Design a protein around this nucleic acid. Structure first.
Lengths: 63, 189, 102, 95, 132, 103, 117, 94, 57, 35
RNA sequence: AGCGUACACGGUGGAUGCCCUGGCAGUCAGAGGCGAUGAAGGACGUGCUAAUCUGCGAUAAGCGUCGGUAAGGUGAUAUGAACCGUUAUAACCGGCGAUUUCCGAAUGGGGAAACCCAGUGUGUUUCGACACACUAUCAUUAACUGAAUCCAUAGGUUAAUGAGGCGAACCGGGGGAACUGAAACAUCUAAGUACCCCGAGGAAAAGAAAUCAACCGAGAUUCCCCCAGUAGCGGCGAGCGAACGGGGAGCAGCCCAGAGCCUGAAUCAGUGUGUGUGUUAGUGGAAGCGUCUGGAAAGGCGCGCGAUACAGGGUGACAGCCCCGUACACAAAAAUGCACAUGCUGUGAGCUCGAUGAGUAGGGCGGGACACGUGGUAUCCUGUCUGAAUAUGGGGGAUCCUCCAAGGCUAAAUACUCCUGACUGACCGAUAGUGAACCAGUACCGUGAGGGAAAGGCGAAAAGAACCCCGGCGAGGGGAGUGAAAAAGAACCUGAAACCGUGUACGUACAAGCAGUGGGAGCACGCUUAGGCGUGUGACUGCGGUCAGCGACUUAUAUUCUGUAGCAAGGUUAACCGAAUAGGGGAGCCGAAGGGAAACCGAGUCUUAACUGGGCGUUAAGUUGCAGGGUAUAGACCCGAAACCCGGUGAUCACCGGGAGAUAGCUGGUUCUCCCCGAAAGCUAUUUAGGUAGCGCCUCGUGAAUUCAUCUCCGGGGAGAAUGUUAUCACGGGAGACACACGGCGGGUGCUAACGUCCGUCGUGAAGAGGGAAACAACCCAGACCGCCAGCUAAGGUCCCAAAGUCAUGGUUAAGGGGGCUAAACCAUGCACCGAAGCUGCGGCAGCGACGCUUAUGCGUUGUUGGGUAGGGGAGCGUUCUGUAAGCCUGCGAAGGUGUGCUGUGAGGCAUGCUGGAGGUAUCAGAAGUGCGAAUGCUGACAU
């Protein structure tokens, strides 16, 4: 996961980052506050994955 | 006088004034006290009434009588070294050597060395001579002997030029090699 | 490295259990370890209807210093100290007393 | 046999509680209870509660015969300040 | 050892009778005080009432020489009226004058019993006769 | 039967048997000393001192042990000058048991 | 070389107070007055170690005089008779025999009278 | 034997600490002098205006010296060419 | 020769220093002390100087 | 607003003496530099 | 009914004992800056979060790559839920990076700090918004525009660079006080100190003679030790303070001045390569078992083993062999400092001639300011003109001596620590050390600068009390259980005193003035088998604001003396080097020769022309360390003012920090024991009334004639007996007193009174206790070494109070502290007795002299002495720490708390019961933050 997606092009990195953020962040935050989502593993996992994608997408395309 | 070598039954000629002078108790005590005082590291200090953090004169809070105030006679780092005349030092060493000779606490050997730097060999050698807490004084320091004797707490090793009044007293017996004996004789004149 | 690992048969050298063998469950990060049936405590747990209250007095296992447990080898039946040795590519533990690799 | 019961850090003055305690020292519990019942002093409630606790402890921790219990050692000690709190102590024993 | 000390529990005292007829007030009172204090007995102890009870009869027969009949004053009457009304008071005050000041002194003084008439209710105690 | 004798400058009247307290006398514990001085012998008709230092009366006594008396704290200082001086004193003594009295 | 003075000070105060027991409250508990009370008690003891001889001498003289008066002689005349009779009996023993057995004192007084003239 | 070692009697005094308790009590510049001990034996101490500074007996820059005598005469040193005191002819020649 | 006996009778606290020196010369260092002396005019003068506090026998 | 207009952080920082006061406060390490 | 006493059992209290994740003081190395590419310091967020610390910044206890390591891990409080990983993509550590909200120089504008409001350019677009960059000033460079003024310039614009601010000391420069002291203004010191401002630095500054000196000579700057606290300056007073020269660490002198000859020649700084050596993670790393106590062994007992590792730490009590470690041997993908040979850009090896610094010095002319006013007056500059030759000449001190300025640079030794790593300590251990060991510059106080605390400990492991009961579904407690211990329960190690309580035994209720002491019954408990014995109380009787802690003569430099040790006419090193307490270093200082105004002489020496003058020395040994007693200077044994100045904060009606531990004067306090001796409040001159310089009394050590005192005689000092521990004199150290009171005697003055005056005799007290006159410092007797339930006495007394004569021999007397006495008063005598801490009797201790055992003690003795304020001398106890000491005691019980017994003249010491539950320390030496009963002392608690 960490390096397998390194070879991905900038456009698909952009689209997957947008999808991941706009879907997972909102869904987890809403369910995390509505009493659902008894497990907190996903909350940290999605944030860490978003950070990892953010570290890419700038040096890959030169920012 | 004559010192038995304990291995060849050969006497060593040594000046009477060096290994036979009368034991001057006062001089030896003064020299050892001076040596002990020289090792002091007088690193300390207390805050006087003018150094304790604070201000105002509403008497004053920083007075010694007041709590958390300064010390009346706060000490400062000082040097406790005491001068000792060369002649006094040499006389003290000569008196100590003479007393050790008289009390049979001093023994002389042909050569003291071990084959390899192994503490076991040195321990066995000292056991053969019924020696447990001794100061071995030699000439050209041997790496093997120095390494072997480093671990043994009771046993110490040094060269003839590094003897001190306290070392010759604190250790039960002294083993000066013939070369070390000659070197000490020359050093003490 | 760590001389005591999971699922290692050990003997408690000292501390009320001289000679009682056991198997290590887990090793704490503070230097203590937990072994099967060497230190039994009678904890008086506070009741809680939820969270699966064990009920009554819980007879559980306490932690002991790692220095009080020694690796046990069936070769000689007596606990002996363990050192580390380099294999062709990896590092492995081995007892003393003829250096029998674990 | 001897049963103890004390109340620590009571919110009352030591002298006030002593004034009530002196009214039952050496008396029988059967009469101590109903003497404290009608006492209008504030410390009377505290002393009565402590005595009832002592009687209950004697009951549960001993066999029977609550009637013969006597107030042998009742005393109030000064407690920590902030209005000095008081430590009340009552000892009930058949003999 | 230790010098003997009289025990007040086991003090032995004997009653005595003294007649004041034809005797000087001062000397008779001095003898009375000495007898009350117990000094005459060998068992005398300063802190113990080791004396003996004494009964004085015929107090009105007190005789004093000189012009003391007018000079003497007790508390502001005169000696004559006092001897006429209460002869016992003169003897009582005199004896009080020769005793220590304190509870023990009062206790010793209480032993003395002075009356003007010879008859006395204490005859049942077999009081011995003493001469002065 | 009580005898009056002087040993250390103060007279003692001692009855037969009972031990008595005296000053320190340089005599061994085992030795039995004779008190050649007697001032009175008591009987049905006691014999008085016809001449001082009655020669016909001798008291036989044995010393049991020496010792020191009870500790006494003496303050020789006075005048209330805010000074403290509490010296200690323990007078030597000897207890002697008397056996046999000669008239 | 800092030294804390607590131990020695407490030991000294305890030693001083141990000999001040029973002094009516403050003088037995407050050190500042307990020390003065102890000093005053010591001084009074020093004075009384001497006054005891005087008091006992007076008591013995009184007892001897009282015993002699029973035999018809005064204390001064009795002492004169004893001295002229070459009698070394001490006043303590005289008082003791006077208070214990009267026969001995009768013999003493008779002998004193015999040598008085 | 560090225990046995002790100073001589009267060597070290405690030192009184007052205030504790009540019972505890409380041409000229170039002029010098030559002695008989001086230049007694300096391996060539012949009297002269020179060969005196080298021996290091009196000063460094001293140029004029006398033969003043202060006891301790044990060398038959002969003086010539330098000032001789009138009393110097009795002990030097003796 | 004949030897005389001199004994101090009275104290010397309230006396002049000359009297104290005379007593010291006479050897009477304590009241009641009895000492021997020879027969010389010097002794006679010493006794005469202080006689209200000494006795001669 | 009177307190802030005079002792406020901006007013104090405006003048050199106020800057020295703030420097002393920082050196001492007080939790609040101005208010 | 209460109160007091002793014991037992409890509570508040948190002293004491043990401990350290905290400080203090230093050594050795690194480093000496950070920031518009956005600093120091903050606000707000961020985890599954109710809160704090730490990390981090919308990529928010983390993200990417590369290495080490890895079977555990997701930071902690303080756990839980939910999850990842286990043999190489869990987590952890390090190198290299990405992200890095807002305030803050803050810089797009505004503003009340963390807030509000805009323009331009670009990307995106749900064609609404969103996303990134720029938008303050000055200075410099290139270019375009560009008025006065045609060109050109000032200015504007574009592109580029530097500063803006923060930070402890050190360096340079510019400003810059006051209090106070010198006999007193001035003057000096205070002090270029306190404090303010600008600058680069890792060090800075300075650095190579136009210097000194004297006819011999040193040769850059800076620093250390001597010279020397000397010469000198100074109302010659406080105080200030040299140079030459000598010994040391470093030692480096160069470039241009303008040309020539072969060239770019060595070296230098930059720019790359390869190796080694480190820094930033790390790997390996020796060798114990049985037994006895014990909760547990690392402790005792026995036998083994390692040691180039017995430095250290943890582990159920003290571990070389249990663990981490140490010695030693190894380790780097990446970044980085140093040492080399290497391609390359620039100053370019070496010789010759010039040059030797020119509108410059000098000449001046007038000012100002350097404290320096023409005063003893030196110094910088010009508003201003002139202006000399280049070694043959010029400058400084006629000869002589030294240099070549008016051009420039120069590491080394040298000062400090904001910070980083290691180590050390006769440094502290919670009232100490920092103000802060703990959520401290916090709580809190003031609008403000600023001021500014209290607060540590359960247990080995929370095993942190399931369960039952009283209570209000509380607080609190009693059982059960865990635990060695709950006499460890979260208010948690030890747990004293004041203070407040329960029980037992005893005593006691009108105002005394002490509730103590000697005697001492009685009452309760144990003895004893009775003897009147111990403990608890004390009828009767003689005499008569509190607790615990903290807190005070120390340290440095000079000088004098004493004791002690080495050497000895020699002694002795400083800086520095150093195998670093050794050894080297003799540069330096003291003495050995003094006399003499100097000169001069010399074991001899001078004055006067020389002395009938007396010399002054040698014959006595000085020097260097150690400890101590004094003196002076620094704050100077400790605490205690008003005032003046400087830098700031408030004028809502002066306050904060510093000079400053200011300076006076005058009170207050000054902590353990014992022994011996033992004062004074008096005199001379000065007297700037501050006192001063002496005399006088005291003590200690030495020397001295046997000195002095008393009594006798002689003469107006001499002689003679004995006694007095030399009580006599001199020298040297150290003192205290230097305002004395009362009274008899001889006074002057005078009430011919004096406690008004100062004298000689003095006695009492100060500094002397006791007896008597009722008490009473001034009246009499009398000088307390300690004990005795012994005796004899002095003053005074013998009727009772109150121990002793109602004694005797003769008279007088009716006057009447208490009763009273006709003698129980006054005048005489005699025998007696009482009468003190006086004397004697017994016992015991200590000081000082002589004779005989021992020659330090210990004895026959001999005797004598032993009140004591200030003061002097001597001998001791106690506590912390260091060596002895890896030895000894100690879990069979340490330190501490609390009782008892024994012991010492006492400071104190030993043993032991209970508590305590792990340290303590012998003997001999060494260093003190060393001994508390008060200073309107401080802190906490307890009272009122």
């Amino acid at each position: 996961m960490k390096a397998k997606e390194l070879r991905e092009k900038s456009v698909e990195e952009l689209n997957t980052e947008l999808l991941n953020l706009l879907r997972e962040q909102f869904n987890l935050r809403m369910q995390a506050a509505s009493g659902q989502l008894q497990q907190s593993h996903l909350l940290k996992q999605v944030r860490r994955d978003v950070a990892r994608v953010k570290t890419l997408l700038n040096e890959k395309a030169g920012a | 006088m004559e010192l038995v070598l304990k291995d060849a039954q050969s006497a060593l000629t040594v000046s009477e004034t060096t290994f036979g002078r009368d034991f001057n108790e006062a001089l030896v005590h003064q020299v050892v006290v001076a040596y002990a005082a020289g090792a002091r590291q007088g690193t300390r200090a207390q805050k006087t009434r003018a150094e304790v953090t604070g201000s105002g004169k509403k008497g004053s809070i920083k007075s010694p009588i007041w709590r958390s105030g300064g010390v009346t006679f706060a000490a400062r780092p000082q040097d406790h070294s005491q001068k000792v005349n060369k002649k006094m030092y040499r006389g003290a060493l000569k008196s100590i050597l003479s007393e050790l000779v008289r009390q049979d606490r001093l023994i002389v050997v042909e050569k003291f060395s071990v084959e390899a730097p192994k503490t076991k060999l040195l321990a066995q050698k000292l056991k053969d001579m019924a020696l447990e807490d001794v100061l071995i004084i030699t000439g050209e320091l041997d790496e093997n002997l120095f390494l072997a004797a480093r671990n043994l707490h009771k046993v110490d090793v040094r060269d003839a030029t590094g003897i001190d009044p306290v070392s010759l007293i604190a250790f039960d017996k002294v083993v000066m090699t013939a070369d070390a004996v000659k070197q000490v004789e020359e050093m003490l004149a | 490295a760590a001389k005591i690992r999971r699922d290692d048969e050990v003997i408690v050298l000292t501390g009320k259990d001289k000679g009682k063998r056991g198997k290590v469950k887990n090793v704490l990060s503070s230097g203590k370890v937990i072994v099967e049936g060497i230190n039994l405590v009678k904890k008086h747990q506070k009741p809680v209807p939820a969270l699966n209250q064990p009920g009554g007095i819980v007879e559980k296992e306490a932690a002991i210093q790692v220095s009080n447990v020694a690796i046990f080898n069936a070769a000689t039946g007596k606990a002996d100290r363990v050192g580390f040795r380099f294999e062709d590519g990896k590092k492995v533990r081995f007892f003393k007393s003829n250096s029998e690799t674990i | 046999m001897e049963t103890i019961a004390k109340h620590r850090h009571a919110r009352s003055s030591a002298q006030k509680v002593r004034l009530v305690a002196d009214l039952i020292r050496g008396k029988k519990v059967s009469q101590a209870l109903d003497i404290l019942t009608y006492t209008n002093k504030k410390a009377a409630v505290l002393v009565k509660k402590v005595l009832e606790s002592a009687i209950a402890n004697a009951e549960h921790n001993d066999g029977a015969d609550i009637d013969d219990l006597k107030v042998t050692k009742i005393f109030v000690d000064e407690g920590p300040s902030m209005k000095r709190t008081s430590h009340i102590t009552v000892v009930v024993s058949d003999r | 050892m230790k010098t003997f000390t009289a025990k007040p529990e086991t003090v032995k005292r004997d009653w005595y009778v003294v007649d004041a007829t034809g005797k000087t007030l001062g000397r008779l009172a001095t003898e009375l005080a000495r007898r009350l204090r117990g000094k005459h007995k060998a068992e005398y102890t300063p802190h113990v009432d080791t004396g003996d009870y004494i009964i004085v009869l015929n107090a009105d027969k007190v005789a004093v020489t000189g012009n003391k009949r007018t000079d003497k004053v007790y508390y502001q009457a005169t000696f004559e009226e006092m001897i006429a009304r209460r002869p016992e008071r003169v003897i009582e005050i005199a004896v009080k004058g020769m005793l220590p000041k304190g509870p023990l002194g009062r206790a010793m003084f209480r032993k003395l019993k002075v009356y003007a008439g010879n008859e006395h209710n204490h005859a049942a105690q077999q009081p011995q006769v003493l001469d002065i | 039967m009580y005898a009056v004798f002087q040993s250390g400058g103060k007279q003692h009247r001692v009855s037969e048997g009972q031990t008595v307290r005296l000053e320190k006398l340089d005599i061994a514990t085992g030795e039995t000393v004779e008190f050649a001085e007697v001032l009175m012998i008591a009987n049905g008709e006691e014999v008085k001192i016809g001449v001082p230092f009655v020669d016909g009366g001798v008291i036989k006594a044995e010393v049991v042990a020496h010792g020191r008396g009870e500790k006494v704290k003496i303050v020789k200082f006075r005048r209330r000058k805010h000074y403290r001086k509490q010296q200690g004193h323990r007078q030597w003594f000897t207890d002697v048991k008397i056996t046999g009295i000669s008239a | 070389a800092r030294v804390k003075r607590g131990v020695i000070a407490r030991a000294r105060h305890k030693k001083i107070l141990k000999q001040a027991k029973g002094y009516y409250g403050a003088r037995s508990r407050v050190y500042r007055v307990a020390f003065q009370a102890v000093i005053k008690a010591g001084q009074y003891a020093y004075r009384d170690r001497r006054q005891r001889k005087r008091q006992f001498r007076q008591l013995w003289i009184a007892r001897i005089n009282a015993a002699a008066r029973q035999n018809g002689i005064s204390y001064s005349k009795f002492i004169n008779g004893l001295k002229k009779a070459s009698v070394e009996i001490d006043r303590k023993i005289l008082a003791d025999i006077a208070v214990f057995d009267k026969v001995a004192f009768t013999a003493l007084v008779e002998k004193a009278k015999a040598a008085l003239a | 034997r560090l225990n046995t070692l002790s100073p001589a009697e009267g060597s070290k005094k405690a030192g009184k600490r007052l205030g504790r308790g009540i019972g505890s009590g409380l041409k000229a510049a170039i002029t010098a002098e030559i002695r008989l001990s001086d230049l007694a034996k300096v391996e060539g101490g012949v009297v002269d205006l020179n060969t005196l500074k080298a021996a290091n007996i009196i000063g460094i820059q001293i140029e004029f010296a006398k033969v003043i005598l202060a006891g301790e005469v044990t060398t038959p040193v002969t003086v010539r060419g330098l000032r001789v005191t009138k009393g110097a002819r009795a002990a030097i020649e003796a | 020769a004949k030897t005389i006996k001199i004994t101090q009778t009275r104290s010397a606290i309230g006396r002049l220093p000359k009297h104290k020196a005379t007593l010291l010369g006479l050897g009477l260092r304590r009241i009641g002390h009895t000492v021997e002396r020879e027969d010389t005019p010097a002794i006679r003068g010493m006794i005469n100087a202080v006689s209200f506090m000494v006795k001669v026998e | 607003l009177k307190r802030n207009r005079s002792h406020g952080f901006r007013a104090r920082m405006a003048t050199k003496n106020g800057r020295q006061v703030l420097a002393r406060r920082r050196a001492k390490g007080r939790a609040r530099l101005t208010v």
